[PDB]
Amino acid sequence: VNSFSGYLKLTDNVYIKNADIVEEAKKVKPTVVVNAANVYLKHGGGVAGALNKATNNAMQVESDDYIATNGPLKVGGSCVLSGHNLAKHCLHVVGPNVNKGEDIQLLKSAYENFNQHEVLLAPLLSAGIFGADPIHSLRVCVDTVRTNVYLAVFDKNLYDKLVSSFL
Numbered sequence: 001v002n003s004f005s006g007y008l009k010l011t012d013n014v015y016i017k018n019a020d021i022v023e024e025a026k027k028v029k030p031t032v033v034v035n036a037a038n039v040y041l042k043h044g045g046g047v048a049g050a051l052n053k054a055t056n057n058a059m060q061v062e063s064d065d066y067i068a069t070n071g072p073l074k075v076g077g078s079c080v081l082s083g084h085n086l087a088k089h090c091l092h093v094v095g096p097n098v099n100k101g102e103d104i105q106l107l108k109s110a111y112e113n114f115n116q117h118e119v120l121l122a123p124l125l126s127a128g129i130f131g132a133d134p135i136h137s138l139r140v141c142v143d144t145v146r147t148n149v150y151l152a153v154f155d156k157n158l159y160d161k162l163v164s165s166f167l
Ligand SMILES: O=C1CCc2cc(C(=O)N3C[C@H](C(=O)O)CCC34CCCC4)c(F)cc2N1
Pocket: 020, 021, 022, 036, 045, 046, 047, 048, 050, 123, 124, 125, 126, 127, 128, 129, 130, 134, 152, 153, 154, 155, 156, 158
C-alpha cells in the first residue's frame, strides 16, 4: 500500500491520473519523481522547467555541478539526483526529442531506467515539447516498465484520450 490517490489502474503495474506532476510530488513526496530531462540537464521548459521552478532553481544548480563533473547524459540514459523539496530522489531520464531528430526507438531504452526503482511518479517520456505521440509513449511504458509507475498527465484532454484509447 502506498499514498498515491485517485489513479486509474491500467495494468498490473501502471497507473495514470490527470494531474500536475509538481503538485502530485509536493503532496505525495514519493521516493522517486522522474524528470523529463535533456542530456545537458538544462531544465528550461516542459516538465523539467516546472519541476526546477518548484525547487527554486536548486535542481538546476545541482544539475550544473553534475554536468561539470560527468559531462552530458546519453539519449535514453538517466541519472539519480536529489529530489529537493519534491521527492527523496529525482530520476532524470532523457527520452528522445523528436523536434531534434532523435531516434524514437530510444524511448524503450529511456523507460528501462524506471526498472531500477520499485515505485516512481513520472510523466510520459518524450511527450509534450519532446514531440512524440503520447499514445505511443504510454504503450512503450506499459510494455517496458515492470516496476510500479504512477503517471501524471497534465492535460485533461490528453488524459481522457489516453484512457479512452488504451488497449
Ligand atoms: O503546470 C504545469 C506543470 C507541469 C507541466 C508539464 C508539461 C509537459 O511538458 N508534459 C506534461 C504533459 C501532460 O501530462 O499533459 C505531457 C507531456 C509532458 C510530460 C513529459 C514530456 C512533456 C505541460 F505541458 C504542462 C505542465 N503544466
